[PDB]
Amino acid sequence: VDVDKYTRARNAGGKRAQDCMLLAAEGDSALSLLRTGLTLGKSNPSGPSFDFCGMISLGGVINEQLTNNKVLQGIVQVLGLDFNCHYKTQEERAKLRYGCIVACVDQDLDGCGKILGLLLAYFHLFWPQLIIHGFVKRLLTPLIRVYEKGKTMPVEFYYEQEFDAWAKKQTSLVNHTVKYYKGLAAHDTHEVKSMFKHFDNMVYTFTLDDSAKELFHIYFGGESELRKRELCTGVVPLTETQTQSIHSVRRIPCSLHLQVDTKAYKLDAIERQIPNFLDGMTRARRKILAGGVKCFASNNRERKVFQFGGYVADHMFYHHGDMSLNTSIIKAAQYYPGSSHLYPVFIGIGSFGSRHLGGKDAGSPRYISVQLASEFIKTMFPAEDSWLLPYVFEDGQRAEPEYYVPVLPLAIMEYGANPSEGWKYTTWARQLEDILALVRAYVDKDNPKHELLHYAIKHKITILPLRPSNYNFKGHLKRFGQYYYSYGTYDISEQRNIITITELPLRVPTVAYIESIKKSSNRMTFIEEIIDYSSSETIEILVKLKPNSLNRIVEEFKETEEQDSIENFLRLRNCLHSHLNFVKPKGGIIEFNSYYEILYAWLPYRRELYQKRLMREHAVLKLRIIMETAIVRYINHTLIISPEFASIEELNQKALQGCYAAKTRRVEKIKKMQARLDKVEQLLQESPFPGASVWLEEIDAVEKAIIKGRNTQWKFH
Amino acid sequence: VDVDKYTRARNAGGKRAQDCMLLAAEGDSALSLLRTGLTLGKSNPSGPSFDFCGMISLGGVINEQLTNNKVLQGIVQVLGLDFNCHYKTQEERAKLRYGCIVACVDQDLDGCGKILGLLLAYFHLFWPQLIIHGFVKRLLTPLIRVYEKGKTMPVEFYYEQEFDAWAKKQTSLVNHTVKYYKGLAAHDTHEVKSMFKHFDNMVYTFTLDDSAKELFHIYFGGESELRKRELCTGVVPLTETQTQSIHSVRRIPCSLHLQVDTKAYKLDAIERQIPNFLDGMTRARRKILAGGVKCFASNNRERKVFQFGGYVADHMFYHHGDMSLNTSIIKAAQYYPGSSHLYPVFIGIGSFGSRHLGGKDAGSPRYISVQLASEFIKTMFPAEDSWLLPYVFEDGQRAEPEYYVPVLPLAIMEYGANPSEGWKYTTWARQLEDILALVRAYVDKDNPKHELLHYAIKHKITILPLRPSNYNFKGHLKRFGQYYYSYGTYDISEQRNIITITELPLRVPTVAYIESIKKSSNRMTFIEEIIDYSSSETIEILVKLKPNSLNRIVEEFKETEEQDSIENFLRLRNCLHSHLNFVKPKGGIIEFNSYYEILYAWLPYRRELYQKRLMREHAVLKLRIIMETAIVRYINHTLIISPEFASIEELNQKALQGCYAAKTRRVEKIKKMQARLDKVEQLLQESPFPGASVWLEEIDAVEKAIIKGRNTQWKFH
């Protein structure tokens, strides 16, 4: 009979119950904002007060089990709701203790879309009539406020599209300060008073239409392929026409909320686990790579893991915590047989882990140092074409790019795996002799199979082979049926009755392997002790057998032709199952049936970028030549001399709309840039595609860098 | 019969057991280093191998319960140790499975000192003879390696004092790179091979002397005042004579290890909970304040909590995690009645919390922004005298200062409290009218009580009063006996039978107060519901009584003269208990009996700093005048023009030992600095103490800044 974090209204449940509203706050921070607003006193005479208004918390809330949720039961109790009753008439709705329920949640992904989505789904599942008649409402707080110098009244936008339209029609956004409020806690004290001064103008009602019935089933309660189909297309933002209709009459359709807010939350959760197929890394890992380049620009100095982790959070807008950040940074620098990265981003200084514990024995971030592998990164991810990539913007500030387009596909050349559950992802790295052969054949005109490969693109013939990488693996890779198997290596000492394991399967940690063997009751009946005398990056496990058990080993495992009896008695074989799940660059989920498809899909993105690289280079060379010619004749700045993330058309428009022995060197540089422009004009005309020769040169640089890294232990020193 | 993370030696327990050694690794990272070293193979023929050497892990291990520790039981089992046996003879020690046990732990505070201290205490408690005969040994890895350009052989130091002596005798430390290895995981692969090439040269034996018997009881197993007495003096580093004796014969006395390594760990744990009395903040909070000044130098821009948290970790060497860092940052910016900080360091932008949940309802660091209170900080903590403070160095890099010496004592003017347990610390803020009166009387010569106060310093007469701050508290502060009590305010509605609570005690959260009342069974017999209609920063709690219970309230609580019956029925009174525990600037624990003692102890530190401020200013003014005079006559640099953290004597030595309308302005600036030098010479001669007039001027600036902050809600806008 008691509900925690609930403050009843004065008129709640009385003769004025229909005039009361219940504010469902997402958390304690939301409750504090509501309490401040609801108690402005005489300062806001027309605003809401605790009369005809109550508060309740939606904390936690993370059919049979849905009704057992304590938070949901509290909402039902305080509202007077009852099951087995359909509120199809006004009289049946008149007995509720509150006129309506208003959801006060953050406008972020872990806000409306997840908390509000469950609340809408909960009401739709049991009382669809309440949504139709407008019992469920949403408090739509301003999202973006633009403050202008000399003016105390900001401009408030409830959607990102509205700000973009306003910003486009703005002559210059120099004296305007833009602030993003993705959560209720971000509003300042004076802004809260402004919000509650017009409280009735920010209450939006939910309307149930025909299309929302299917969407509620797809997003909530359905784990079938119906959810997967909706998640393969990405998020479509609301158009201006839909936005204007919402603001004209404050009634938000349920379908629009599900298609935008709920889908974005679902995709964001996947994006944190499933990498993009262009660069083979998630958004968290992209921030580390982008932060690594910025932190280590010249900066040929070692940094501690926690020191570098602070840089990523401060500069690349990483807010998921240092515990996940430090672990991800360490994994980016681990280099050992069976490690996730065959070509680590950073140089491992200290004890970053070992194959025995699968990287879990890494040192503390306090003592472990991280240094960027500058030679490898500058070749695989060129800094010259990083400007052309699209960039993620966090609260109006530039962040790590949407995706990277490396010279070679990292999604194929690395051991990818997804922990936990949901959208299984497993990638086995292909060796760097088939990848180079396939890519060079596509690019090099002189290659004998250049014509055959292009014809195979449209038909998926797959003339050239792709095979799993055997690097740092002294075992056997055998293909049976349509699956690859990796076999460990063992040695048998007949006189000492000891089986020595000189190699494990491809991605099997030593400690976990021994535990798996030690937990097999049948296996323990033949051996007496296992001793792990293995070194670093090399396996040497001594298995001591019973005095008369070696002959009985082969008699029980039947000596399968596919797998040896010892390879059966000792789990020295594993199947290289691949779950090629990736997120598209524009958003969504894409399924790949083979590693050829991933390489084929990645090729256009790299090919187009080289054309975009030259087109922007061709345009900027013309502008600087004109600037250099003009000054020499006399004898805009900060943009032509220092280009930035500007498109081809944007650069041309802004360059014209701008303001205003030594002489010998000015003439010399004009000849250099003119010759380069002629070289650029000589390019972007080759037979295969524009900038094909540049791609071949970068492949050699990447291959040379990888060879140098492999000659050392990825130390480069 | 099975021990986890244990790898037996080939000769362990056999005829060569005495030649075997057991390496007790602190954790998995230590085990990985040992496994790499013990398996160098033919690359290190003379080094140790898994023959005559084993490994075991000391993970976890955090009389009756000591023997129940699984990790300690494992060590006893693998070593063959048995209780009730005293190993006073060689024959009794010959039956052990290993010749000795070597502890491989990090050289940090949470390394040797805590893990090694327990291991030494465990052996001393049960088998003192093993320590005497040398059964317990330590692997002393190099702590500091100095790499010089062009030389591949570094210089290794096992103690901080050795490096300081070597650095002092060094002409110039410009081409030398200094690296600190505070943990075993910090050693690179090539360094590990070097360490194990001379493995026998880094094994040190522990010797038990008479003094160690008392120290073992004091540090371990004794919670009495004996431990407190040892912790009131700080850590005394080992002298060179003791260090040379340790390296000459590799035998470390147990007493020296306890006095240095174990005491430092004990003090470090306290320093993270007990603030220094000069600035009233811990080392974690000092990093935030020091990081705030550096991050917000001009930087009049809001930063997110996690963004600013990353800056502190990256620049101020904060490695305790963002979860504790973000919480500490939020508490530094909270400003509400009953908050810990009456004068917050930062400006609270967003929802930083409320008095109802005691600051626990703060918004997520993702949405919450932090801005430095520049006007208050620049006055309370001047940037001109921050150079004279001693600075903490983390791995050779400058960090937050050892302590701050503000214009007014923050340890007296803030509500300090220590959570968890151990060394109880509670401070109740004194009002800013008694603090200013006391400080001004000490400083101002013209003050009528200036002479009386100075005479009261040596006798602790305490002529002027100090009273608890009543700011943001609409209650009553009554002093009964030797304790202060804060009373809440209530209103009684006889007609409605409702008791309205208009004010709570000084530091009582609203939600916790209601829960405390609601859990009183006797109290619930008189009331039926409690409604929390309180606003932000104001209390309004409606208590609805039973129809005939108001008269029975006064009949049960007897209407005490000290505490009213309603103030007894409702817990509207709390005692202002003060636990004045603080850490001395030089290390240790200092006990204060009254707030006067803390102010009296803080005065010399601020008074001396003003003299040090002028003496350095006097010295630097002379140097720049000479430089300015010399250049004018013609018509070292980067040190005179840009002074740094250099002492008075250091500045003079380095200035001489250095290398080498517009004219009108050069003459004008010489007159300005000459006049300032005359002003400085006019100072440092006043009757009370040097620089007394400057102190009075800064107090007015601090008071004016605080008044402006209190006029707003500490927003300054």
mmCIF file of N, CA and C in Angstrom, chain A residues 298-385:
data_model
loop_
_atom_site.group_PDB
_atom_site.id
_atom_site.type_symbol
_atom_site.label_atom_id
_atom_site.label_comp_id
_atom_site.label_asym_id
_atom_site.label_seq_id
_atom_site.Cartn_x
_atom_site.Cartn_y
_atom_site.Cartn_z
ATOM 1 N N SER A 298 52.758 14.321 -33.110
ATOM 2 C CA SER A 298 54.187 14.057 -33.183
ATOM 3 C C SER A 298 54.588 13.179 -32.007
ATOM 4 N N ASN A 299 54.516 13.765 -30.807
ATOM 5 C CA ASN A 299 54.277 13.093 -29.525
ATOM 6 C C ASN A 299 54.836 11.671 -29.503
ATOM 7 N N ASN A 300 56.114 11.545 -29.847
ATOM 8 C CA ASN A 300 56.738 10.229 -29.850
ATOM 9 C C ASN A 300 57.137 9.850 -28.429
ATOM 10 N N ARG A 301 56.183 9.923 -27.506
ATOM 11 C CA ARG A 301 56.425 9.703 -26.090
ATOM 12 C C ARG A 301 55.398 8.730 -25.527
ATOM 13 N N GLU A 302 55.866 7.825 -24.673
ATOM 14 C CA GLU A 302 54.983 6.850 -24.051
ATOM 15 C C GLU A 302 54.024 7.536 -23.089
ATOM 16 N N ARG A 303 52.796 7.029 -23.030
ATOM 17 C CA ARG A 303 51.790 7.517 -22.102
ATOM 18 C C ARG A 303 51.193 6.344 -21.341
ATOM 19 N N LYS A 304 50.861 6.584 -20.076
ATOM 20 C CA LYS A 304 50.198 5.567 -19.280
ATOM 21 C C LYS A 304 48.801 5.297 -19.829
ATOM 22 N N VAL A 305 48.290 4.100 -19.536
ATOM 23 C CA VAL A 305 46.972 3.718 -20.036
ATOM 24 C C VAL A 305 45.901 4.642 -19.472
ATOM 25 N N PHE A 306 45.958 4.911 -18.165
ATOM 26 C CA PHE A 306 44.969 5.802 -17.569
ATOM 27 C C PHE A 306 45.175 7.243 -18.013
ATOM 28 N N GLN A 307 46.425 7.654 -18.235
ATOM 29 C CA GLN A 307 46.678 8.991 -18.761
ATOM 30 C C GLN A 307 46.119 9.136 -20.170
ATOM 31 N N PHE A 308 46.348 8.133 -21.020
ATOM 32 C CA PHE A 308 45.790 8.175 -22.365
ATOM 33 C C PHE A 308 44.283 7.973 -22.350
ATOM 34 N N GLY A 309 43.774 7.170 -21.416
ATOM 35 C CA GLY A 309 42.335 7.017 -21.292
ATOM 36 C C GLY A 309 41.643 8.325 -20.959
ATOM 37 N N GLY A 310 42.276 9.147 -20.123
ATOM 38 C CA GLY A 310 41.730 10.463 -19.846
ATOM 39 C C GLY A 310 41.709 11.359 -21.066
ATOM 40 N N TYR A 311 42.712 11.232 -21.936
ATOM 41 C CA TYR A 311 42.738 12.029 -23.158
ATOM 42 C C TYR A 311 41.576 11.671 -24.074
ATOM 43 N N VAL A 312 41.285 10.377 -24.214
ATOM 44 C CA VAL A 312 40.199 9.945 -25.090
ATOM 45 C C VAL A 312 38.860 10.449 -24.570
ATOM 46 N N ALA A 313 38.637 10.342 -23.259
ATOM 47 C CA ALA A 313 37.381 10.813 -22.684
ATOM 48 C C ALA A 313 37.238 12.322 -22.829
ATOM 49 N N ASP A 314 38.335 13.059 -22.656
ATOM 50 C CA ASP A 314 38.263 14.515 -22.709
ATOM 51 C C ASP A 314 38.102 15.021 -24.138
ATOM 52 N N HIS A 315 38.784 14.397 -25.098
ATOM 53 C CA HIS A 315 38.823 14.913 -26.459
ATOM 54 C C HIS A 315 37.883 14.199 -27.419
ATOM 55 N N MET A 316 37.676 12.893 -27.262
ATOM 56 C CA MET A 316 36.839 12.136 -28.184
ATOM 57 C C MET A 316 35.460 11.832 -27.616
ATOM 58 N N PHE A 317 35.090 12.451 -26.495
ATOM 59 C CA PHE A 317 33.746 12.338 -25.929
ATOM 60 C C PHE A 317 33.397 10.883 -25.618
ATOM 61 N N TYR A 318 34.207 10.263 -24.767
ATOM 62 C CA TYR A 318 33.978 8.897 -24.313
ATOM 63 C C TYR A 318 33.406 8.966 -22.901
ATOM 64 N N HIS A 319 32.159 8.522 -22.741
ATOM 65 C CA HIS A 319 31.453 8.637 -21.471
ATOM 66 C C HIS A 319 30.971 7.288 -20.950
ATOM 67 N N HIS A 320 31.572 6.193 -21.401
ATOM 68 C CA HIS A 320 31.167 4.863 -20.975
ATOM 69 C C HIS A 320 31.956 4.354 -19.777
ATOM 70 N N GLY A 321 32.839 5.164 -19.219
ATOM 71 C CA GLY A 321 33.607 4.761 -18.061
ATOM 72 C C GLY A 321 35.014 4.331 -18.429
ATOM 73 N N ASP A 322 35.945 4.549 -17.501
ATOM 74 C CA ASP A 322 37.336 4.187 -17.748
ATOM 75 C C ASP A 322 37.561 2.684 -17.662
ATOM 76 N N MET A 323 36.715 1.966 -16.918
ATOM 77 C CA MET A 323 36.891 0.524 -16.785
ATOM 78 C C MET A 323 36.752 -0.171 -18.133
ATOM 79 N N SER A 324 35.743 0.211 -18.917
ATOM 80 C CA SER A 324 35.625 -0.322 -20.268
ATOM 81 C C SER A 324 36.628 0.325 -21.211
ATOM 82 N N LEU A 325 36.988 1.584 -20.959
ATOM 83 C CA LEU A 325 37.931 2.276 -21.831
ATOM 84 C C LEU A 325 39.338 1.715 -21.677
ATOM 85 N N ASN A 326 39.792 1.531 -20.435
ATOM 86 C CA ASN A 326 41.136 1.007 -20.212
ATOM 87 C C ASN A 326 41.272 -0.409 -20.753
ATOM 88 N N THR A 327 40.240 -1.234 -20.576
ATOM 89 C CA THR A 327 40.274 -2.586 -21.123
ATOM 90 C C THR A 327 40.355 -2.559 -22.643
ATOM 91 N N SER A 328 39.596 -1.666 -23.279
ATOM 92 C CA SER A 328 39.635 -1.564 -24.734
ATOM 93 C C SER A 328 40.980 -1.034 -25.217
ATOM 94 N N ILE A 329 41.576 -0.097 -24.478
ATOM 95 C CA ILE A 329 42.892 0.418 -24.849
ATOM 96 C C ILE A 329 43.939 -0.683 -24.760
ATOM 97 N N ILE A 330 43.883 -1.490 -23.698
ATOM 98 C CA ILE A 330 44.845 -2.576 -23.534
ATOM 99 C C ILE A 330 44.710 -3.587 -24.665
ATOM 100 N N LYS A 331 43.475 -3.957 -25.010
ATOM 101 C CA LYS A 331 43.265 -4.908 -26.097
ATOM 102 C C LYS A 331 43.768 -4.364 -27.426
ATOM 103 N N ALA A 332 43.734 -3.043 -27.606
ATOM 104 C CA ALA A 332 44.229 -2.448 -28.840
ATOM 105 C C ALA A 332 45.744 -2.530 -28.959
ATOM 106 N N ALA A 333 46.448 -2.818 -27.866
ATOM 107 C CA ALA A 333 47.902 -2.878 -27.873
ATOM 108 C C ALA A 333 48.450 -4.266 -27.580
ATOM 109 N N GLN A 334 47.595 -5.239 -27.282
ATOM 110 C CA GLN A 334 48.067 -6.596 -27.048
ATOM 111 C C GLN A 334 48.579 -7.213 -28.340
ATOM 112 N N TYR A 335 49.715 -7.902 -28.249
ATOM 113 C CA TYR A 335 50.300 -8.567 -29.411
ATOM 114 C C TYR A 335 50.903 -9.884 -28.933
ATOM 115 N N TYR A 336 50.186 -10.976 -29.171
ATOM 116 C CA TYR A 336 50.642 -12.311 -28.814
ATOM 117 C C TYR A 336 49.914 -13.308 -29.702
ATOM 118 N N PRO A 337 50.426 -14.533 -29.824
ATOM 119 C CA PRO A 337 49.717 -15.549 -30.617
ATOM 120 C C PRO A 337 48.301 -15.754 -30.105
ATOM 121 N N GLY A 338 47.335 -15.630 -31.011
ATOM 122 C CA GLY A 338 45.941 -15.731 -30.643
ATOM 123 C C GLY A 338 45.308 -14.452 -30.149
ATOM 124 N N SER A 339 46.014 -13.326 -30.215
ATOM 125 C CA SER A 339 45.424 -12.063 -29.805
ATOM 126 C C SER A 339 44.388 -11.605 -30.825
ATOM 127 N N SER A 340 43.491 -10.728 -30.370
ATOM 128 C CA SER A 340 42.427 -10.242 -31.241
ATOM 129 C C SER A 340 42.988 -9.437 -32.407
ATOM 130 N N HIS A 341 44.011 -8.628 -32.156
ATOM 131 C CA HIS A 341 44.602 -7.775 -33.178
ATOM 132 C C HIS A 341 45.891 -8.402 -33.689
ATOM 133 N N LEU A 342 45.914 -8.744 -34.979
ATOM 134 C CA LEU A 342 47.169 -9.134 -35.610
ATOM 135 C C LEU A 342 48.053 -7.925 -35.872
ATOM 136 N N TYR A 343 47.449 -6.751 -36.038
ATOM 137 C CA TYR A 343 48.165 -5.508 -36.311
ATOM 138 C C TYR A 343 47.682 -4.470 -35.310
ATOM 139 N N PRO A 344 48.204 -4.501 -34.084
ATOM 140 C CA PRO A 344 47.692 -3.609 -33.040
ATOM 141 C C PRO A 344 47.902 -2.143 -33.384
ATOM 142 N N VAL A 345 46.960 -1.315 -32.933
ATOM 143 C CA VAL A 345 47.046 0.120 -33.172
ATOM 144 C C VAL A 345 48.226 0.723 -32.420
ATOM 145 N N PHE A 346 48.418 0.326 -31.168
ATOM 146 C CA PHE A 346 49.465 0.881 -30.326
ATOM 147 C C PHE A 346 50.618 -0.104 -30.177
ATOM 148 N N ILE A 347 51.713 0.393 -29.610
ATOM 149 C CA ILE A 347 52.884 -0.419 -29.305
ATOM 150 C C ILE A 347 52.831 -0.797 -27.834
ATOM 151 N N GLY A 348 52.845 -2.096 -27.559
ATOM 152 C CA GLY A 348 52.742 -2.577 -26.197
ATOM 153 C C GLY A 348 54.014 -2.411 -25.393
ATOM 154 N N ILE A 349 53.991 -1.519 -24.410
ATOM 155 C CA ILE A 349 55.125 -1.280 -23.528
ATOM 156 C C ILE A 349 54.731 -1.760 -22.139
ATOM 157 N N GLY A 350 55.404 -2.795 -21.662
ATOM 158 C CA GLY A 350 55.072 -3.431 -20.406
ATOM 159 C C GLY A 350 54.445 -4.796 -20.625
ATOM 160 N N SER A 351 53.747 -5.262 -19.591
ATOM 161 C CA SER A 351 53.074 -6.560 -19.630
ATOM 162 C C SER A 351 51.609 -6.331 -19.973
ATOM 163 N N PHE A 352 51.289 -6.446 -21.260
ATOM 164 C CA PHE A 352 49.925 -6.262 -21.734
ATOM 165 C C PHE A 352 49.097 -7.538 -21.693
ATOM 166 N N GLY A 353 49.680 -8.661 -21.295
ATOM 167 C CA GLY A 353 48.974 -9.918 -21.219
ATOM 168 C C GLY A 353 49.712 -11.014 -21.950
ATOM 169 N N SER A 354 49.087 -12.187 -21.974
ATOM 170 C CA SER A 354 49.681 -13.352 -22.608
ATOM 171 C C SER A 354 48.573 -14.272 -23.093
ATOM 172 N N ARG A 355 48.946 -15.184 -23.993
ATOM 173 C CA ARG A 355 47.982 -16.119 -24.557
ATOM 174 C C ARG A 355 47.435 -17.086 -23.518
ATOM 175 N N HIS A 356 48.131 -17.256 -22.394
ATOM 176 C CA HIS A 356 47.715 -18.243 -21.405
ATOM 177 C C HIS A 356 46.390 -17.862 -20.757
ATOM 178 N N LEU A 357 46.200 -16.581 -20.448
ATOM 179 C CA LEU A 357 44.943 -16.095 -19.894
ATOM 180 C C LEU A 357 44.117 -15.319 -20.910
ATOM 181 N N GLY A 358 44.517 -15.324 -22.177
ATOM 182 C CA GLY A 358 43.752 -14.634 -23.204
ATOM 183 C C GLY A 358 43.700 -13.133 -23.023
ATOM 184 N N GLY A 359 44.794 -12.533 -22.568
ATOM 185 C CA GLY A 359 44.848 -11.104 -22.363
ATOM 186 C C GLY A 359 44.267 -10.617 -21.056
ATOM 187 N N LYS A 360 43.770 -11.513 -20.204
ATOM 188 C CA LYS A 360 43.220 -11.113 -18.917
ATOM 189 C C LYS A 360 44.291 -10.865 -17.866
ATOM 190 N N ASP A 361 45.533 -11.287 -18.115
ATOM 191 C CA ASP A 361 46.639 -11.063 -17.193
ATOM 192 C C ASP A 361 47.392 -9.776 -17.489
ATOM 193 N N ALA A 362 46.735 -8.802 -18.111
ATOM 194 C CA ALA A 362 47.371 -7.525 -18.388
ATOM 195 C C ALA A 362 47.656 -6.779 -17.092
ATOM 196 N N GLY A 363 48.700 -5.961 -17.120
ATOM 197 C CA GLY A 363 49.050 -5.171 -15.962
ATOM 198 C C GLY A 363 48.047 -4.064 -15.705
ATOM 199 N N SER A 364 48.146 -3.487 -14.515
ATOM 200 C CA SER A 364 47.256 -2.400 -14.151
ATOM 201 C C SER A 364 47.537 -1.182 -15.026
ATOM 202 N N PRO A 365 46.510 -0.406 -15.388
ATOM 203 C CA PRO A 365 46.736 0.797 -16.201
ATOM 204 C C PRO A 365 47.633 1.829 -15.540
ATOM 205 N N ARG A 366 47.808 1.770 -14.220
ATOM 206 C CA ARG A 366 48.718 2.677 -13.533
ATOM 207 C C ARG A 366 50.161 2.502 -13.990
ATOM 208 N N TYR A 367 50.609 1.261 -14.187
ATOM 209 C CA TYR A 367 51.997 0.990 -14.532
ATOM 210 C C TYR A 367 52.228 0.734 -16.014
ATOM 211 N N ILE A 368 51.179 0.459 -16.778
ATOM 212 C CA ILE A 368 51.323 0.066 -18.175
ATOM 213 C C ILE A 368 51.321 1.309 -19.055
ATOM 214 N N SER A 369 52.271 1.380 -19.982
ATOM 215 C CA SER A 369 52.404 2.504 -20.895
ATOM 216 C C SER A 369 51.958 2.110 -22.298
ATOM 217 N N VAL A 370 51.470 3.102 -23.038
ATOM 218 C CA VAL A 370 50.947 2.912 -24.386
ATOM 219 C C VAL A 370 51.613 3.910 -25.321
ATOM 220 N N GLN A 371 52.101 3.417 -26.456
ATOM 221 C CA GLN A 371 52.687 4.269 -27.479
ATOM 222 C C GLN A 371 52.076 3.901 -28.822
ATOM 223 N N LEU A 372 51.747 4.914 -29.617
ATOM 224 C CA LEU A 372 51.108 4.689 -30.906
ATOM 225 C C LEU A 372 52.101 4.096 -31.897
ATOM 226 N N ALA A 373 51.653 3.094 -32.655
ATOM 227 C CA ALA A 373 52.443 2.536 -33.750
ATOM 228 C C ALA A 373 52.316 3.483 -34.938
ATOM 229 N N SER A 374 53.136 4.535 -34.910
ATOM 230 C CA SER A 374 52.995 5.620 -35.875
ATOM 231 C C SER A 374 53.238 5.142 -37.300
ATOM 232 N N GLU A 375 54.249 4.294 -37.500
ATOM 233 C CA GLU A 375 54.595 3.869 -38.852
ATOM 234 C C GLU A 375 53.471 3.061 -39.488
ATOM 235 N N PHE A 376 52.837 2.177 -38.716
ATOM 236 C CA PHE A 376 51.758 1.367 -39.270
ATOM 237 C C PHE A 376 50.492 2.189 -39.482
ATOM 238 N N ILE A 377 50.142 3.042 -38.517
ATOM 239 C CA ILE A 377 48.893 3.792 -38.603
ATOM 240 C C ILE A 377 48.937 4.794 -39.750
ATOM 241 N N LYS A 378 50.064 5.492 -39.915
ATOM 242 C CA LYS A 378 50.159 6.514 -40.952
ATOM 243 C C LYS A 378 50.015 5.935 -42.352
ATOM 244 N N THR A 379 50.215 4.630 -42.515
ATOM 245 C CA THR A 379 50.060 3.970 -43.803
ATOM 246 C C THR A 379 48.697 3.315 -43.972
ATOM 247 N N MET A 380 48.244 2.547 -42.979
ATOM 248 C CA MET A 380 46.942 1.895 -43.086
ATOM 249 C C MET A 380 45.807 2.911 -43.074
ATOM 250 N N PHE A 381 45.877 3.900 -42.183
ATOM 251 C CA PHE A 381 44.879 4.960 -42.089
ATOM 252 C C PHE A 381 45.558 6.273 -42.446
ATOM 253 N N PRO A 382 45.617 6.640 -43.726
ATOM 254 C CA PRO A 382 46.305 7.879 -44.103
ATOM 255 C C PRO A 382 45.649 9.093 -43.465
ATOM 256 N N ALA A 383 46.482 10.041 -43.043
ATOM 257 C CA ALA A 383 45.977 11.287 -42.486
ATOM 258 C C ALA A 383 45.576 12.284 -43.559
ATOM 259 N N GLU A 384 45.941 12.030 -44.816
ATOM 260 C CA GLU A 384 45.606 12.946 -45.895
ATOM 261 C C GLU A 384 44.144 12.835 -46.306
ATOM 262 N N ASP A 385 43.560 11.638 -46.230
ATOM 263 C CA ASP A 385 42.167 11.437 -46.609
ATOM 264 C C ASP A 385 41.245 11.274 -45.407
#
